Amino acid sequence: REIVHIQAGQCGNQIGAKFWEVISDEHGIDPTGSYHGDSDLQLERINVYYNEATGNKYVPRAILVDLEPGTMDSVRSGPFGQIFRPDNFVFGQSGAGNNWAKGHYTEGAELVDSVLDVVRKESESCDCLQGFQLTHSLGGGTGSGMGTLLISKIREEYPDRIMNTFSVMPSPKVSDTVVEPYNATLSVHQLVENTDETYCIDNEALYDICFRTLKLTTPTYGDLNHLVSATMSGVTTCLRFPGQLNADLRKLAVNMVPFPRLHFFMPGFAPLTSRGSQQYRALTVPELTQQMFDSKNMMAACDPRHGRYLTVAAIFRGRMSMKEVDEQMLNVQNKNSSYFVEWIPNNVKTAVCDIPPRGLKMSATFIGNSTAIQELFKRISEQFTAMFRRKAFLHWYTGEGMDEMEFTEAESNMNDLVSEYQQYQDA
């Protein structure tokens, strides 16, 4: 059951590269693609994410995409950059200028067939393709505009495969341009229709965590991406390793999404750690459980107590008592039962994996489908309309052939998404 990974644009390729660094280390693959590994749990499901090449090398099933060559050069210059298959670098030259319209309609359209050709080659070698995972931001032009263009075309050619994304939401606290709310809103409209699951990675939350919890005065994208790579490693655990669950992307979708459009997840992680500085006391299973459910550990800047959990998936990594894990997980639900919808019985499922992530003896990763995610979309909707009511900065988009009407439809669809999440928060 092979997954095809695609990373698009500046943010997509930077968090994409970190993800492949991190899970390669967990599976015992070095920058050359060779396995110098301790345990054999590391290789049992290694084919979900890695093609095997002659000479027992492991090559990521990864495609790197950008309309601008710069950050893909840095990836190839990067530590594990030599592990990626060079044919799977697909890039243009003109960039996207932080413009969804250029990524989606004019620049990205010129390049998208070359990417689909690379997607096809990787898929035809798959015994049974699960589907795809895309890393991208929603605030730029390439990951957002061309990424959602790729999703739409991938769906046309593979309509029975699962589409999963890790989507980084823009925040004024960590912001490149004023038009991010425009790019994000146009993208969400695409994500609502064309993904089965998207992890909402909120740059607001990543910033708040670094500043407040990790006491990092001036957080860089490097500090943000340490959080992102830890979250990506955790939420993938049950796809990559053998366990009592043996999950795949479709089963995750079936068990997490009660209504098709409500497929946007708040990820959570514990313990929260900053890069480089290690702390030497492991948590207790009781500590892991409380931190993973704490709003201060959510990667989407929403208060869970402002909504209800439709479904939750939790994964505990490290050598620990599964009895204690079970008791602590039962404890949080029984003590906080009002925050779990009563009409989905037993909507919390826990998995355990023996292999911990690098640098931690124990970790807990949280995947929540909460109606509180609507706060994220409301925040973006306010920033959109603040400019849109004066049609501010629109010429960047009408200059690529876009119409105001398209902005009105995307805003209206995202408002409907907020309404639907509100509908189930009271039931």
């Binding site: 030259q93 003109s94 200028g97 932080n98 413009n99 004024p172 912001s175 490149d176 341009t177 004023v178 038009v179 005065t217 001036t218 920033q383 603040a386 400019m387 009511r389 004066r390 501010a392 900065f393 010429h395 960047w396 200059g399």
Partner: protein, 440 residues
């Protein structure tokens, strides 16, 4: 790639081009003969400085530039000056009769005789670009060539290079150093004709630059050379992101996204600091907080106007030298509490920041002290429309009596071109009023 071609038009544009390219050579280690010892890429390369310089097989680094004037006097000094070997002779274009301070002669009578040759030379530069990004056009508002030939060229460039980016550095007239009484006419005519063909235009008010040289450099009566050394420092700050690499470098085109909310509102206010004499910089280092603060002191603006009585639609900070984001963020936070920075209600209030580590260079024998860190702020403020108001008023005093209009009519222009141009300016001044009004 991503090459930029510079076009220097008329006296002011040519002479400012001299200052700028001299400063660029010093910043990149390019000698007057065009040799650059640290460039190991002989005859080519995709380095950052290659956006502004091409390379010959003989190792010569050549400005991607064209100098055009309708008379030979000013460009002849480039042909015989310190940097003559830098330019290929075909890059330096001269006619024989200037525009005689008359937009109609720059645009029609004299200008039309040389425009095709100028576009042939520009085309030869574009054909050497693998990724041409656009043009930087330097000229005065007030000269006959800077106004009339520039607008003719901008029109022809839109035809020949679609909507390829076109940026302007425009010298706004001041009585202290102006040369003609009809400069208000030429300014309004060229602003009107060029408005649709320009994406972004940096106005430099000669009175603001003249005051800064007098106040901060203790120059009793500044010359063009004094003004241009300061102006080239500002131009260098704006183009530094295109010409240097950097982890914290932010591309000028990314600032443009923020600076231009509507096509016609494309005139950023530039403020530069520190401008300080050697005598005063001695044993006196200016911190990130001090130079940032100075960007909100109106006396340091490139255009006289009062942003304290206007509204902001964008605010960008371009740092160069020994600056780290932590100092910048600290300086901004205190400034927000202590200063009159009111944004329009439809745009976000954050400040966009770029840092290039290469510290500022000074021309030997100049007046500026060499400093460790400098900053250019680029703000979209409704206040910049005051400069339009002053010019439109001067235009109105003369035009009501039709004073001097016969010199333009005698070259084939019609009165309707004047009123059409003045109406566009009135609508521009009104555009700036409307963007500042609260939403409903």
């Amino acid at each position: 790639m991503r090459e930029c071609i510079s076009i220097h038009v008329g006296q002011a544009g040519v002479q400012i081009g001299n200052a700028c390219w001299e400063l660029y050579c010093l910043e990149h280690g390019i000698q007057p003969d065009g040799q650059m010892p640290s460039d190991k890429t002989i005859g080519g390369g995709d380095d950052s400085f290659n956006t502004f310089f091409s390379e010959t097989g003989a190792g010569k680094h050549v400005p991607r530039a064209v100098f055009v004037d309708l008379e030979p006097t000013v460009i002849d000094e480039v042909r015989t000056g310190t940097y003559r070997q830098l330019f290929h002779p075909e890059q330096l274009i001269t006619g024989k009769e200037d525009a005689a301070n008359n937009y109609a002669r720059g645009h029609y009578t004299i200008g039309k005789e040389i425009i095709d040759l100028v576009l042939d030379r520009i085309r030869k530069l574009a054909d050497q670009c693998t990724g041409l990004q656009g043009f930087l056009v330097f000229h005065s508002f007030g000269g006959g060539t800077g106004s009339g030939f520039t607008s003719l060229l901008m029109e022809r460039l839109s035809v020949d290079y679609g909507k390829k980016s076109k940026l302007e550095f425009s010298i706004y007239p001041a009585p202290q150093v102006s040369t003609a009484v009809v400069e208000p006419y030429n300014s309004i005519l060229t602003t009107h004709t060029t408005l649709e063909h320009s994406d972004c235009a940096f106005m430099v008010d000669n009175e603001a630059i003249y005051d800064i040289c007098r106040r901060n450099l203790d120059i009793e009566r500044p010359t063009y050379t004094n003004l241009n050394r300061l102006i080239s420092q500002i131009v260098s700050s704006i183009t530094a992101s295109l010409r240097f690499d950097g982890a914290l470098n932010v591309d000028l085109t990314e600032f443009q996204t923020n600076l231009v909310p509507y096509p016609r509102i494309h005139f950023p206010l530039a403020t530069y600091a520190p401008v300080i004499s050697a005598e005063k910089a001695y044993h006196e280092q200016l911190s990130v907080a001090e130079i940032t603060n100075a960007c909100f002191e109106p006396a340091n603006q490139m255009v006289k106007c009062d942003p304290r009585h206007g509204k902001y639609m964008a605010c960008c900070l371009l740092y160069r030298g020994d600056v780290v984001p932590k100092d910048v963020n600290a300086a901004i936070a205190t400034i927000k509490t202590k200063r009159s920075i009111q944004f329009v209600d439809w745009c976000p209030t954050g400040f966009k920041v770029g840092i290039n580590y290469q510290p500022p260079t000074v021309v030997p024998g100049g007046d500026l002290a060499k400093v460790q860190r400098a900053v250019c702020m680029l703000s979209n403020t409704t206040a910049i429309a005051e400069a339009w108001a002053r010019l439109d008023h001067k235009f109105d005093l003369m035009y009501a009596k039709r004073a001097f209009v016969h010199w333009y009519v005698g070259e084939g222009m019609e009165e309707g071109e004047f009123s059409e141009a003045r109406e566009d300016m009135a609508a521009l001044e009104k555009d700036y009023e409307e963007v500042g009004v609260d939403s409903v």
